[PDB]
Design a binder for these strands. Sequence first.
DNA 1: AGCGTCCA
DNA 2: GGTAGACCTGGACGC
DNA 3: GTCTACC
Length: 316
Amino acid sequence: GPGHRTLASTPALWASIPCPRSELRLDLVLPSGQSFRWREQSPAHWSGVLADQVWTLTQTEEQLHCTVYRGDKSQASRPTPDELEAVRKYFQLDVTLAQLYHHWGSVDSHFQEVAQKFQGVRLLRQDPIECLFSFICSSNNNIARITGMVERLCQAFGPRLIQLDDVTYHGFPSLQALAGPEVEAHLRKLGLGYRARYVSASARAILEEQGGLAWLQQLRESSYEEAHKALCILPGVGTHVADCICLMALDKPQAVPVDVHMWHIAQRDYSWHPTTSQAKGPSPQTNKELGNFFRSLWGPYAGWAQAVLFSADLRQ
DNA sequence: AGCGTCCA
DNA sequence: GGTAGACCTGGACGC
DNA sequence: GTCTACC
Ligand SMILES: [Mg+2]
Ligand SMILES: [Mg+2]
């Protein structure tokens, strides 16, 4: 198919959004385990599906440059202002990251040191369905493998969008696509392991037991506590996956995922131990205390601070 | 050499 | 509620 | 990382 675009080579097809590197580093956000659907198909150029369309993104010092492949047999043209607003919303650019970094660094000198090297790590605002099923796939697993599972899940069950070069892009599957009694066995052939049943069972639960797609909007409008509790009803969603979804798709900036990385960070970089449990290893009680510890330390956007340290820890 | 354990 | 261990997969890599 | 079973 047509080639993946670069900014320098097809300038007529790109438009910019004001966005300095202090506010965003694509290379520190897009491959760091928030979204699993972005690939650096050309040096410094990241391609993926954003609001039912394929986009390529690249940065200069003060601007985020965007191009869209509409794939409705229309003539090529640069993104419109309305189309760019979707990119703006996806990166939540109304939030000023430099001021959060200053606050987090002021209360936490360890954060300040890490942040000096890892500028521009912000939080994507993801589709709730894509976020839910991607993080169901993420549990007890590594980002490289998760990325392939999500890719194959979309290849098999999501709509075909367009082909660029050798890469056929697919939308994320609908709930209905994932709910049939045949889907589990298919997801097992696609290598999802025991999470195959979690994905299909969770799609069925939402459609059959929670009122369908509107439930996720209900949770977006609910409190952190209410949304986090409700998600845990789903098979494969425990407190950590629920926190991932709250933080990254349901607009709960205080939600703090606690995985193997955050637990190692707490022990190694903060010398933290639980004080609400005599036993100190990971458990429901100690994982809960650790999330509360990070909220007490970092404040209302603690989950965003978590994203900085998580992204940094992937590179060590 | 590549099996088998560790780990995400 | 606390605790322990099993669990799909496949890359890293010690031996 | 979540589930299931047992105390
Ligand atoms: Mg560039
Ligand atoms: Mg659950």
